[PDB]
Amino acid sequence: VYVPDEWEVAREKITMSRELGQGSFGMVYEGVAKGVVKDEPETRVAIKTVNEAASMRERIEFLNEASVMKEFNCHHVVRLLGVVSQGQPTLVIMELMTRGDLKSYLRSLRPPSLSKMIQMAGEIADGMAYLNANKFVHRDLAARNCMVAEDFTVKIGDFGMTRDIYETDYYRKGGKGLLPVRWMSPESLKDGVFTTYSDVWSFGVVLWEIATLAEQPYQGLSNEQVLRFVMEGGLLDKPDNCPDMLFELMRMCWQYNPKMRPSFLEIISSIKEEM
Ligand SMILES: CC1(C)C(=O)N(c2ccc(S(=O)(=O)C(F)(F)F)cc2)C(=O)N1Cc1ccnc2[nH]ccc12
Numbered sequence: 001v002y003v004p005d006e007w008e009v010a011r012e013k014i015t016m017s018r019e020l021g022q023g024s025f026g027m028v029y030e031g032v033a034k035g036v037v038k039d040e041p042e043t044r045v046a047i048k049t050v051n052e053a054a055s056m057r058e059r060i061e062f063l064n065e066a067s068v069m070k071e072f073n074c075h076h077v078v079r080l081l082g083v084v085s086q087g088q089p090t091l092v093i094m095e096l097m098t099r100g101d102l103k104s105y106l107r108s109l110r111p112p113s114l115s116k117m118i119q120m121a122g123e124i125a126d127g128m129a130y131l132n133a134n135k136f137v138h139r140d141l142a143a144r145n146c147m148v149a150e151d152f153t154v155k156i157g158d159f160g161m162t163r164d165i166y167e168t169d170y171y172r173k174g175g176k177g178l179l180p181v182r183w184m185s186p187e188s189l190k191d192g193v194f195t196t197y198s199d200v201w202s203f204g205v206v207l208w209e210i211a212t213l214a215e216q217p218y219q220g221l222s223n224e225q226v227l228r229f230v231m232e233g234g235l236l237d238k239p240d241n242c243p244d245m246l247f248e249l250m251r252m253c254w255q256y257n258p259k260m261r262p263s264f265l266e267i268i269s270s271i272k273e274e275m
Pocket residue numbers: 020023028046047048068069072077078094095096097098099100101131136138147156157158159160
């Protein structure tokens with residue numbers, strides 16, 4: 001089961017406003033929470049819900065997925081603030097990222113400086129180095145799962161695979177689970193091997209998204225064509241107008257042998273040696 005703890009928040013302290021989109025287990029909303037941040041009477045929050053229909057099994061899956069976040073203390077990972085495990089619906093509340101997901105934000109820009117692009121890259125790498133140091137492999141790192149604050153700071157999040165807006169980013173390979181095949185490493189595509197090294201592959205696709213303002217990777221290829229192209233050692237082209245430094249960083253992340261890719265710590269160092 002799930003054992004309630006000091007992260008429990010009384011439900012009456014939480015107010016919902018408009019919806020943010022369909023999560024893995026239910027609708028996600030924007031809202032306000034009383035008594036969750038020190039020196040702060042009201043806090044704007046994201047509220048993740050479980051469908052009333054969902055099984056007690058799936059409720060416990062949702063809670064135990066949020067319990068991973070209790071261990072986190074990184075300002076580049078979206079922060080847990082509370083859990084509502086008592087009564088229906090089951091909620092978890094987090095810090096609200098007012099500008100939404102990075103894919104949406106990049107689409108909205110449709111000429112960033114190397115400076116702004118490398119700053120975002122470094123913010124993402126900060127949160128991914130932290131997660132990978134805490135034995136967390138994200139498996140769906142992509143601009144659509146990065147989140148943008150009021151101040152334009154980027155943080156790692158996860159909105160799951162079920163939002164209608166990003167239906168084209170997922171393939172039900174063999175009719176089974178949805179897979180983000182255009183962001184997946186060769187070894188993830190071939191053998192279902194997901195590692196810190198496959199997160200670094202996906203990071204290189206996020207850099208390509210930054211540099212294209214979130215074009216579709218491998219536009220023109222079907223999902224089956226992407227599988228073959230990437231597993232046979234094919235790569236995304238250098239984006240139009242791409243700075244040398246950003247494309248070089250992408251190429252490092254796309255080494256076919258996962259042991260040849262930089263770690264996120266090495267990415268942060270090489271971004272700090274430009275600054
Ligand atoms: C769906 C929801 C609320 C959520 O649950 N998460 C989430 C955050 C962190 C993790 S985590 O395990 O720490 C990580 F990052 F994967 F390592 C998991 C899920 C989100 O990002 N979300 C979107 C979201 C959050 C805040 N403000 C927003 N504004 C617009 C969407 C939005």
